[PDB]
Design a protein around this motif. Structure first.
Motif, mmCIF file in Angstrom:
data_model
loop_
_atom_site.group_PDB
_atom_site.id
_atom_site.type_symbol
_atom_site.label_atom_id
_atom_site.label_comp_id
_atom_site.label_asym_id
_atom_site.label_seq_id
_atom_site.Cartn_x
_atom_site.Cartn_y
_atom_site.Cartn_z
ATOM 1 N N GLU C 546 0.814 -1.193 0.071
ATOM 2 C CA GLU C 546 -0.003 -0.009 -0.021
ATOM 3 C C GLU C 546 1.029 1.084 0.046
ATOM 4 O O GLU C 546 0.441 2.350 -0.333
ATOM 5 C CB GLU C 546 -1.043 0.105 1.382
ATOM 6 N N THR C 547 2.190 0.950 0.398
ATOM 7 C CA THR C 547 3.124 2.308 0.307
ATOM 8 C C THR C 547 4.400 1.396 -0.277
ATOM 9 O O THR C 547 5.348 1.094 0.435
ATOM 10 C CB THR C 547 3.314 2.653 1.762
ATOM 11 N N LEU C 548 4.576 1.504 -1.797
ATOM 12 C CA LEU C 548 5.669 0.946 -2.496
ATOM 13 C C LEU C 548 6.747 2.201 -2.545
ATOM 14 O O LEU C 548 6.474 2.772 -3.263
ATOM 15 C CB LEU C 548 5.182 0.505 -3.744
ATOM 16 N N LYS C 549 8.036 2.101 -1.660
ATOM 17 C CA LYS C 549 8.727 2.932 -1.866
ATOM 18 C C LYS C 549 9.813 2.600 -2.765
ATOM 19 O O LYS C 549 10.982 1.958 -2.312
ATOM 20 C CB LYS C 549 9.288 3.168 -0.492
ATOM 21 N N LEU C 550 9.612 2.572 -3.956
ATOM 22 C CA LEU C 550 10.327 2.059 -5.149
ATOM 23 C C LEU C 550 10.598 3.123 -6.197
ATOM 24 O O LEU C 550 11.468 2.966 -6.956
ATOM 25 C CB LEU C 550 9.826 0.832 -5.609
ATOM 26 N N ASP C 551 9.566 3.889 -6.787
ATOM 27 C CA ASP C 551 9.479 4.883 -7.608
ATOM 28 C C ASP C 551 10.619 6.069 -7.095
ATOM 29 O O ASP C 551 10.114 6.782 -6.161
ATOM 30 C CB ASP C 551 8.114 5.340 -8.106
ATOM 31 N N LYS C 553 10.720 8.696 -8.222
ATOM 32 C CA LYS C 553 10.055 10.101 -8.162
ATOM 33 C C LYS C 553 9.011 10.242 -7.151
ATOM 34 O O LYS C 553 8.193 11.250 -6.961
ATOM 35 C CB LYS C 553 9.288 10.255 -9.739
ATOM 36 N N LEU C 554 8.730 9.190 -6.442
ATOM 37 C CA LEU C 554 7.770 9.333 -5.273
ATOM 38 C C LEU C 554 8.505 9.250 -3.948
ATOM 39 O O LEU C 554 8.105 9.649 -3.084
ATOM 40 C CB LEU C 554 6.742 8.096 -5.450
ATOM 41 N N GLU C 559 15.129 6.202 1.137
ATOM 42 C CA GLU C 559 14.073 5.548 1.595
ATOM 43 C C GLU C 559 13.744 4.282 0.668
ATOM 44 O O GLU C 559 13.365 3.107 1.188
ATOM 45 C CB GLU C 559 12.816 6.552 1.241
ATOM 46 N N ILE C 560 13.924 4.411 -0.720
ATOM 47 C CA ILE C 560 14.078 3.157 -1.512
ATOM 48 C C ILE C 560 15.349 2.130 -1.100
ATOM 49 O O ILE C 560 14.739 0.909 -0.918
ATOM 50 C CB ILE C 560 14.252 3.478 -3.210
ATOM 51 N N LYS C 561 16.421 2.651 -0.536
ATOM 52 C CA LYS C 561 17.224 1.586 -0.260
ATOM 53 C C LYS C 561 16.923 0.744 0.845
ATOM 54 O O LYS C 561 16.992 -0.377 0.861
ATOM 55 C CB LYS C 561 18.704 2.515 0.083
ATOM 56 N N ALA C 562 16.452 1.603 1.887
ATOM 57 C CA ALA C 562 16.023 1.124 3.166
ATOM 58 C C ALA C 562 14.903 0.181 2.906
ATOM 59 O O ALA C 562 14.841 -0.744 3.554
ATOM 60 C CB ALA C 562 15.514 2.159 4.230
ATOM 61 N N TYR C 588 -0.065 9.816 -13.338
ATOM 62 C CA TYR C 588 -0.431 10.850 -12.203
ATOM 63 C C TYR C 588 1.150 11.149 -11.232
ATOM 64 O O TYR C 588 1.458 11.893 -10.500
ATOM 65 C CB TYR C 588 -0.794 9.926 -11.113
ATOM 66 N N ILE C 589 2.037 10.431 -11.946
ATOM 67 C CA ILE C 589 3.480 10.646 -11.188
ATOM 68 C C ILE C 589 4.187 11.650 -12.063
ATOM 69 O O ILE C 589 4.377 11.345 -13.200
ATOM 70 C CB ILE C 589 4.343 9.240 -11.313
#
Ligand SMILES: Cc1cc2nc3c(=O)[nH]c(=O)nc-3n(C[C@H](O)[C@H](O)[C@H](O)COP(=O)(O)OP(=O)(O)OC[C@H]3O[C@@H](n4cnc5c(N)ncnc54)[C@H](O)[C@@H]3O)c2cc1C
Ligand SMILES: Cc1cc2nc3c(=O)[nH]c(=O)nc-3n(C[C@H](O)[C@H](O)[C@H](O)COP(=O)(O)OP(=O)(O)OC[C@H]3O[C@@H](n4cnc5c(N)ncnc54)[C@H](O)[C@@H]3O)c2cc1C
Ligand SMILES: Cc1cc2nc3c(=O)[nH]c(=O)nc-3n(C[C@H](O)[C@H](O)[C@H](O)COP(=O)(O)OP(=O)(O)OC[C@H]3O[C@@H](n4cnc5c(N)ncnc54)[C@H](O)[C@@H]3O)c2cc1C
Lengths: 590, 590, 590
Positions: C546-551, C553-554, C559-562, C588-589
């Motif tokens: 529900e909270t994909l910290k991968l993009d 640009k988002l 955050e992505i690394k962690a 939307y991104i």
């Protein structure tokens, strides 16, 4: 798009669902919502009543008369609780209605402030939807859902709305109406296997009878055609008289108290019953079907199948389609002693009723008041009937056809339903003649609202039966009670009250004056006046058809003598005599 | 001993508890019980109303006026639901009352029969007792317990009674009344430690104020003596005005809307508050005590201690005993600038009210109607007040003393409480003058019951304020609303309606005619007639004391000018001026 | 015919409705009814549980798994109240069930006797039928109606039955069952006008997506065929995974927390949504459809149309028929960048899940437990899933097809639903493999009932995830909470408890031991033993989709690394990359 007031969004949603009339009384806990009415071309109108219960009942009767979804409002606390009789009536009758309960503003909730309380318990038992709006921004969504739920669940949708919410502003894109998605199921065809089973039982029956409830509304001609085809008499319910031509040769009326003598005798002698679209509430407790051999039921609600009696054949589907399928498959019947006997029994009853209706002089009885209505009413007149004895007996007299509509509070039976019924009816059909037939007891609970018809120029004809007593009540005492005590009262001048309210009042107490008075009342109504006809009638009680003391094998000579004398029924003949005259024998008498 | 009818045992039990009056309407589902009334010398009487809600409210107001335990009945379904506004009022006011809900006979329960339903959910939320009688033989026991519970729990006791139960016979030894065991706690003395703490705070206070609620009923003289001893002004609640002599020098009135200017200003300038016997509902939401430094509370209910504000001192016990103990221990205060300033502020307000009341000619305003009441009312008159703006404002005008009783629907605030109040009052005090002060809106919800006063020879004086609008409501709109919409109506001739009901009607619209009309109305009432005075008043709204636009440091010159002009308040002086005149400074202004 | 015991008539009625299993615990207030079970060849059996809530849940889950109408009993008072979680689950899921509340005998009602109370209020809010039997003779009729109502209204039918009623005898002709009249509507065809409107929107859409709920149950092949025809990816709900072949190329999973990464990304990039047979509860609060352009909904319940989002097209009718009509009329789509991008996104997710499932050695994680289940489960296995985090995540791992059934407590979400689910499932399918997947918290609320499976020889496989914490709960804290506090506990030996109960227990904590342990557990279950596999897993939490910290640009690089490090998701690729690879751009991104 841009920004919009929440109250206005609510009004836009109501309008989209066709709910263009809100009934109630203005108040602080409802002002923010009402303030939005109108503006931005919204066409939702407010009809102010004198007592909130009349507003609730009017919103409900509006739908009963085929009008749009009604909305009723009640101020926080007493206004909200005043809606109860109207909401209970809707719940039991399965009529859609939206009830908005006003409330002190959010900050006051739970603080034990003035006229502040938890109103969620109030209608939880009867509602199909019952929520307290949690924050302003969701009010539109919940009003939309309340309308959707009221309609889909055929019941009361209740929303408790803090008075500060409607003042809030939101983005126009933060609300929407689902009215556009409204869909309803079209008549569903019945299972051939079940229709065939019904046809077989009907073909082989020696004494078939059709017992039709409002499920057959809109299909009376077909039911009459079927009755004639297989020679099966017709019994109707207290809610379904308009479905048949009043003078149909085989209409026996309805059973039990608010019924006719023929139907009450027919059902006890019948073999096979075609129970079409009915949920007759007296079935079990009065042993209505105690002598029947086979029971066929048609209904669109599975919950009703086999409810009132064991069903030998159950048909799930539209009564119209079912009657059509049965009519097409059943064998025609040319002659029937059963049919002939019933037709004579019906004719005998009609002679009796006609004799009472056409008296020429003497103290006025309700019989002659109904006679005058028949002689002056439009063919498409609407009848809003209250729950008293003298008013429910209207089904023995009114010469209705499907062009008419007759509605009351039939199951919950709340007194005072007539006036609000007239409001809902006149609001829906402004150019149609509307009659409110009320007993003095019921009138006394709602006459202050006669002024509402006056104020909003919704002219109706109020026919009030005054006899200083609650007839029905006092009438039953003489049976279930070995006494009486308290059930009468003084004689209030209802005509004068009507005048004081801006309506036109008439007073009549003699049979020879009834026609002229009714003529003047109707002409006055056509002049745009709401009228009140105070009919000072006798203490006479409608003959008890649930206890027919006429057959010499069921009652003593003295009982029959007294029964005939009291109800002017010397010429009424017990059904068994007509059966034996055609070579048949009673299946239960002796 | 031997055998006894269950209905009669029920009546014997009610009589033993002092419940000699049953209010309601006769019906089939209640006939068996009513049939027992009378006989065997039972003295329980039945008072038949036109609408069951009036019966419920009358049974409740009977106790509010110090009468016996009231009993109200409602027929199964609609009769029962019609009791709601009366029962909710009793629940919120903590007034004992027994409600009997009639029901279809046992055999019909759960059969989905006519007017048959589960009524247990109906009042479960508000009742202290709510049971459906399971079998006939236990009906007496449950009626006895309902009376015991209604009284002990100070609330609504509800019994649903199948209509066939009262007909059953039982052995005389199978029932008993526990009325003989009725016991109540006598006034309980407060803890000396708490009284001493209160005395210390009062002695050291520079601006003490006594805020007295109905807990002080019966002890007004003592409260006035204490006020004079420590020079502490008195603030009362909208329910407690009769406790004080209307002309007491230090009576500032009540706070918020239904209040006076003095009290509203005093509370915001006070330092120490002696909150005696009150549960003032506006406390938190209106920030009544926002400027006070110390708060002392006296109450007999632990649940109330510290409820409306943090209490620096809490005294559990009878307000009478507490006031007496405080009075005895506190130091006398000879002079006080705070007291002097308050007395002048009160006098200024009284000049204003007197000027309005004594106008000589012009269009009638409610001020002069109250003036006429003061000039013709008996010293022990009873006042049954409805909930509208023009009626609640009666506390600014009526010259009451403890010899009077003033009751309304103060918290639930149901409209239409006046007429039933008059019935309950007149039933309890047949030789006492009873006044029902009603606004047109509230009157319109209950005037059909004026005939009840006529029929039972319980003469009352109905004072009706007619102005084609719901004042209070429409009056608030001009503030909380930036609009208005719907809140007015035609002009019904209430005097004519009264005549049609057997009552005497009067119509008055001019100040110069008010005295004579009131004189004739009173004389007519003394001739045994129920009267209705239709007072056609102006659209004038009582001055808003919750928003006093008079102090030049709180409002603009233009606002003050407009405020004074609209409310004829040119001579009203802001309290700060009186404070500064005595060398004091406002503690919050500037 | 002749005479029959009322309890026996009740059992005959239940049997006629197919309700051959009653769940509960024997008690004095239920003994008279239970005593009738059996005898006269009645085939109604009693399944005794250890806690009444398990009995209620089992009766309900029985229907969820396609079994017969369930009946659950609770002794007067505590037994009855213990049914609550099971009844609330049924009410919210719209599952038919009959609940019988025992009660002290009639003579004790309202006497404030031992364990005697009014139980009508208990379930009035959630029941479709809720009555207290008034007398013995009507018990059969009400049980019959309760079954009829439970089924017709798809809900909880409750009857409170005094314990002395079932002992009474009646004439055999005084009761009947309406089970023979049971009728249900067959799938109804949708309006062509609405189907055509849907087809037009789908034809013109650049990014169509099918969002299928359980309304599509039984029609997965058709939905998959439609997805392939117009190249529209498929999103399912947490309740509808079995409808699709687990390896379907275009299955993106479900949205929000208990979902997959693909579906969560797809819905935010979609243009047109075909919402078929769903009432997805997270729709509004999680802004699921915030970026969609058009919304088409198919449902058989009018109350659902336009509920979760404004519907541009509303289709009332069976999802099967609707999907078939749409499939037949829509234009085939050969190639689609949107489809290609989605297929790659799905494949990427499957690589990740496969990698977790197939680890070879190390501390056991729930991923490998599910892997073992897939490798040993029968193709038609039944899965009873509890509500914890580790159990709901089963939809990311189980390789199901329509041959399987997966049921839980999806909306009310009561913990402890798994074991009762297994009982209801095994009772309905005795020769079928049944799995109960439970977290330690939920297991701890119901493990005493493992003995019930043992006692009745209804062997099931209990897979228990133990990690000394409530994962889901503690997992969310790290987000919505800036702290934690209390959410862990000791390590109970569930395998040992199982042994003490007559079941076979296993303990596993290493990946390299999982396969053998699962093999032994299954073989033991095939030997007729109920088994409990205590899986001592790590504290690892399922990746938050529900909270994909991968993009990039988002979210930030850190955050992505962690995020990747914590969830072993180094290889997960944000959907936008796959879209851009096919020449498309995020809607939307950015
Ligand atoms: C004081 C008083 C006295 C009364 N006395 C009597 C009396 O003596 N005798 C009497 O008969 N009534 C009497 N009534 C009215 C009575 O109480 C019932 O309300 C009425 O008889 C119910 O009539 P019904 O069966 O037509 O309809 P309902 O009870 O409304 O049931 C209608 C049935 O039709 C079904 N249906 C609806 N649409 C369709 C469709 N398209 N196809 C198939 N089925 C459909 C419904 O599912 C339902 O089951 C009295 C009322 C009052 C207030
Ligand atoms: C339309 C409308 C407007 C109103 N506007 C106002 C307004 O502006 N201002 C206003 O003041 N009121 C107003 N009221 C009335 C108001 O709502 C409250 O009902 C009233 O103020 C409560 O007064 P109370 O505190 O005296 O008594 P209650 O609220 O009845 O509380 C009495 C307290 O006394 C205690 N008590 C009882 N006996 C004893 C004893 N022997 N010893 C000690 N303690 C005892 C009780 O436990 C209780 O806590 C209005 C009412 C209506 C209908
Ligand atoms: C702890 C927990 C976490 C969860 N997390 C998630 C999550 O992250 N994501 C998720 O998706 N779910 C989740 N769920 C499940 C979720 O709460 C909902 O219960 C589920 O998504 C509802 O699925 P549904 O729409 O298929 O069916 P329902 O809500 O049951 O609605 C089905 C709809 O289909 C209609 N229908 C029925 N038959 C037909 C027919 N023949 N033709 C047409 N229409 C028909 C019905 O009228 C109804 O509107 C979770 C549950 C739990 C307990």
């Amino acid at each position: 798009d841009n920004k919009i007031n929440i109250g206005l969004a609510v009004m836009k949603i109501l309008e989209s669902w066709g709910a263009d009339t809100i009934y109630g009384i203005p108040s602080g806990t409802l002002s923010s919502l009402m303030d939005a009415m109108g503006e931005e071309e919204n066409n939702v109108k407010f009809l102010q009543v004198k007592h909130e219960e009349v507003g609730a009942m009017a919103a409900v009767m509006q739908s009963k008369f085929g009008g749009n979804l009604g909305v009723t409002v009640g101020s926080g606390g007493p206004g909200a609780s005043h809606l109860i009789n109207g909401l209970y009536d809707a719940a039991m009758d399965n009529i859609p209605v939206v009830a908005i309960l006003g409330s002190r503003p959010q900050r006051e909730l739970n603080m034990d402030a003035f006229q502040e309380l938890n109103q969620n318990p109030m209608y939880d038992h009867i509602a199909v939807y019952n929520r307290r709006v949690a924050y302003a921004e969701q009010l539109p969504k919940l009003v939309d859902e309340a309308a959707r739920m009221a309609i889909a669940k055929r019941g009361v949708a209740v929303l408790e709305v803090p008075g500060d919410f409607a003042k809030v502003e939101i983005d126009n894109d933060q609300w929407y109406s689902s009215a556009n998605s409204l869909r309803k199921y079209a008549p569903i065809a019945p299972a051939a296997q079940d229709i065939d089973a019904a046809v077989e039982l009907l073909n082989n029956s020696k004494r078939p009878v059709i017992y039709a409830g409002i499920g057959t509304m809109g299909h009376g001609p077909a039911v009459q055609e079927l009755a004639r085809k297989i020679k099966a008499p017709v019994i109707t319910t207290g809610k379904n008289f308009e479905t048949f031509e009043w003078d149909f040769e085989a209409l026996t009326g309805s059973t039990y108290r608010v019924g006719w003598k023929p139907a009450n005798e027919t059902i006890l002698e019948a073999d096979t019953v075609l129970f079409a679209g009915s949920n007759f509430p007296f079935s079990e407790v009065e042993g209505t079907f105690r002598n029947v051999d086979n029971f066929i039921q048609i209904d669109i609600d599975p919950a009703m199948l086999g409810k009132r009696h064991h069903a030998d054949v159950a048909i799930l589907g539209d009564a119209a389609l079912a009657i059509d399928e049965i009519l097409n498959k059943v064998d025609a019947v040319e002659e029937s002693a059963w049919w002939t006997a019933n037709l004579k029994n019906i004719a005998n009853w009609r002679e009796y009723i006609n004799m009472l209706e056409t008296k020429e002089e003497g103290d006025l009885q309700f019989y002659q008041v109904y006679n005058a209505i028949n002689n002056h009413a439009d063919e498409d007149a609407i009848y809003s009937i209250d729950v008293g004895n003298s008013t429910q007996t209207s089904i023995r007299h009114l010469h209705m056809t499907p062009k008419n509509m007759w509605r009351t509070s039939p199951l919950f039976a709340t007194m005072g339903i007539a006036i609000p019924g007239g409001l809902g009816a006149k609001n829906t059909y402004p150019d149609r003649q509307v009659w409110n037939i009320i007993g003095d007891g019921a009138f006394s609970m709602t006459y202050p609202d006669v002024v509402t018809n006056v104020r909003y120029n919704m002219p109706v004809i109020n026919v009030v039966f005054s006899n200083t007593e609650y007839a029905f009540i006092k009438n039953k005492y003489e049976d279930t009670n070995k006494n009486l005590f308290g059930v009468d009262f003084t004689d209030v001048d209802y005509a004068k009250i009507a005048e004081a309210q801006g309506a036109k009042g008439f007073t009549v107490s003699r049979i020879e004056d009834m026609d002229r008075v009714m003529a003047e009342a109707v002409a006055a109504n056509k002049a745009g006046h709401t009228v009140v006809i105070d009919c000072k009638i006798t203490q006479d009680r409608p003959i008890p058809v649930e206890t027919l003391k006429l057959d010499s094998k069921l009652y003593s000579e003295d009982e029959i003598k007294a029964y005939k004398e009291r109800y002017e029924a010397a010429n009424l003949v017990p059904f068994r005599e007509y059966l034996e005259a055609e070579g048949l024998e009673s299946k239960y008498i002796k």
